[PDB]
Nucleic acid binder design. Structure first.
Ligand SMILES: [Mg+2]
Ligand SMILES: [Mg+2]
Lengths: 188, 140, 71, 55
RNA sequence: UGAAACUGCGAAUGGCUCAUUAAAUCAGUUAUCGUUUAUUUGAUAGUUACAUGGUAUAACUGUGGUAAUUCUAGAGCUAAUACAUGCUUAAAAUCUCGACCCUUUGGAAGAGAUGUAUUUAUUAGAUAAAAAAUCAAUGUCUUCGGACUCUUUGAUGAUUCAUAAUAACUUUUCGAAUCGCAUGGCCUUGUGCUGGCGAUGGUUCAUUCAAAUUUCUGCCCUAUCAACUUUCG
């Protein structure tokens, strides 16, 4: 099908190479799975070797990591806002690697109230022993609780959906987030 | 102009912790190439991001090592070197001059100008025709 | 009002039997996937009932501010 | 059909996984003993290096 | 013993020919810290009704169709190392919570989790010659003024390597419901518990047969071919 052969191109001097052989099974290429938002729909794709490759067509959930506290929670994905390869994958709401989505901030907040104990925005004895044990770690840069006020975090996606079948990434931090929001406001 | 370009430029799988207030805002990772090649100091204190740099990125050096003389520096982060050599025709018992142009990658830790001699090492296939990588610069 | 509540109750009565049949029909391999699908269906039904109640009551942030606060 | 032979084979599978587990556990214990005595000898060599440099 | 058939395997080797192809194939020489690898060989898995679940069908019987194919329809059976389910195991350790105890310097009954594989994030993966001052935590004793009486692994020239740990993740991958030989020991005498030789199957690591790209140098004639490549890479 899609041949990723290097003899069908030109050379380094622009000469037209002739055809040399028929296209091979060890050099094939598949049609891409332009992965949308929807109910969970993953197709199995058999590879070269005795291996097997997932192909995520429509997916909605993900295991997104928080960089600072070192937690990763299974959390729904709302929609794609911004994407580096093309601007048209934003229009079709496409999850790929580094395609940036808005992720809802409910279970990170519900962990955070169980682990840090201060509400954002606006009794069992060992638990307040533990929240007395952690004092200095409760400070996060202002953009994160500004996103918690709306309950929608921005997160990048690091796991390729067309190979793994998953959609897992990391929440944007102040350097990453600051540059990406300034060019978001430059677009908006 | 480090974040001039369209996605963010970072070394992969590095972390700067916001909870711990450090003196330097960017922890940088570097490795030595081997073969007695000294890492330049601008690789360590620098702020650039490059995957194909052998001192800051995910490219090893292995195989043949070559020396040449650069002719073209006119394109983005890759330069073209030129090796002149002698080829021996056995019937006439005397040599022929010949030359081959190989386009090599260059990290921004090197200030390479045309006329200088470089030292290139083999790496993984970086592009269609680039297969090499500059690891030493000699001023001329 | 009362008709929307009766429709939501009938939808919950159908969805409970559907979730119980899906839980009973599952094997040891697919039980986690069936539980995730049932939890997603329950969350979607609760969100649909809340949106229907909000519509029945009605009928009858930006990154620039984050940039200004950061700078 | 449940025969005595299949019970014997199931018994042999259970017994083999058991004795493989104790064999690799005692191999791990003997190697832990070897690494502990090697580190003790290494600390003794460190001690004689420190007293020859102190003298 | 064994026609047929299911299942496993092979049929991707061998054999032939030289049409295309002029940095193409190839020759010598590298590389894979850039990958897949049925088989062989060696290691590898106490963590998930068990006197051993379930269902289809072929082969076969019977009825058929057409000029004709290694064509097959309907009906009636029944197997697995087919298909699909589905339990079991020892101690110990460590973390998440934690009923109560009292106000110190706090310590705890109890509950849950911790095999392997996938995916993400983070951390460890160190090695030049010696020292002192402070604050905590501890193992500590008080002449309650005081201070110490005891902790630190591999490889490569090179790595974000090998590998380990934490937080989770997953149409939950694997963790034997198989078969041939001799049938043995231990008694509370149950037809109870143990018990060998070796074929197949299986996750992963390594090896092997390989494969795939890949580095340097090399090709016959032609200027009556001097500029070629980029909308279409
Ligand atoms: Mg026989
Ligand atoms: Mg084997």
């Amino acid at each position: 099908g899609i041949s990723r052969d290097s003899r069908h191109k030109r050379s380094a001097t622009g000469a037209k190479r002739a055809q040399f052989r028929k296209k091979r099974k060890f050099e094939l290429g598949r049609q891409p799975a332009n992965t949308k938002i929807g109910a969970k729909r993953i197709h199995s794709v058999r590879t070269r070797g005795g291996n097997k490759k997932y192909r995520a067509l429509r997916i909605e959930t993900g295991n997104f990591s928080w960089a600072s506290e070192g937690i990763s929670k299974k959390t729904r994905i709302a929609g794609v806002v911004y994407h580096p390869s093309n601007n048209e994958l934003v229009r079709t709401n496409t999850l790929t690697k580094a395609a940036i989505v808005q992720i809802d901030a409910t279970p990170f907040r519900q962990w955070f109230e169980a682990h840090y104990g201060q509400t954002l925005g606006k009794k069992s004895k060992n638990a307040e022993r533990k929240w007395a044990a952690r004092a200095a770690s409760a400070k996060i840069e202002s953009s994160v609780e500004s996103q918690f006020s709306a309950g929608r975090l921005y997160a990048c996606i690091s796991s390729r959906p067309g190979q793994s079948g998953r959609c897992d990434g990391y929440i944007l931090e102040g350097e990453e987030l600051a540059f990406y929001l300034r060019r978001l406001t430059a677009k908006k | 102009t480090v974040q001039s370009e369209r996605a963010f430029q970072k070394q992969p799988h590095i972390f700067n912790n916001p909870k711990v207030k450090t003196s330097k805002r960017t922890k940088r990772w570097y490795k030595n190439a081997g073969l007695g090649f000294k890492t330049p100091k601008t690789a360590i204190e620098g702020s650039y991001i490059d995957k194909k740099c052998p001192f800051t990125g995910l490219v090893s050096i292995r195989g043949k090592i070559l020396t040449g003389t650069v002719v073209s520096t006119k394109m983005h982060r890759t330069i073209v070197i030129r090796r002149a050599y002698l080829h021996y025709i056995p019937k006439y018992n005397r040599y022929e001059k010949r030359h081959k142009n190989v386009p090599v990658h260059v990290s921004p830790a090197f200030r390479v100008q045309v006329g200088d001699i470089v030292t290139v090492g083999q790496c993984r296939p970086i592009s269609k025709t680039v297969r090499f990588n500059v690891v030493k610069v000699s001023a001329a | 009002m009362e008709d929307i509540l009766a429709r939501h109750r009938k939808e919950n009565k159908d969805l409970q039997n559907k979730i119980t049949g899906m839980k009973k029909q599952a094997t040891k391999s697919k039980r986690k996937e069936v539980n995730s699908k049932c939890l997603d269906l329950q969350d979607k039904l609760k969100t649909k009932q809340e949106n229907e109640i909000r519509d029945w009551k009605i009928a009858n942030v930006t990154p620039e501010k984050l940039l200004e606060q950061l700078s | 059909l449940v025969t005595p032979q299949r019970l014997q084979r199931k018994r042999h599978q259970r017994a083999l996984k058991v004795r493989n587990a104790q064999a690799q556990r005692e191999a791990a214990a003997e190697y832990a003993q070897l690494l502990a005595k090697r580190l003790s000898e290494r600390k003794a060599e460190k001690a004689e290096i420190r007293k020859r440099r102190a003298s």
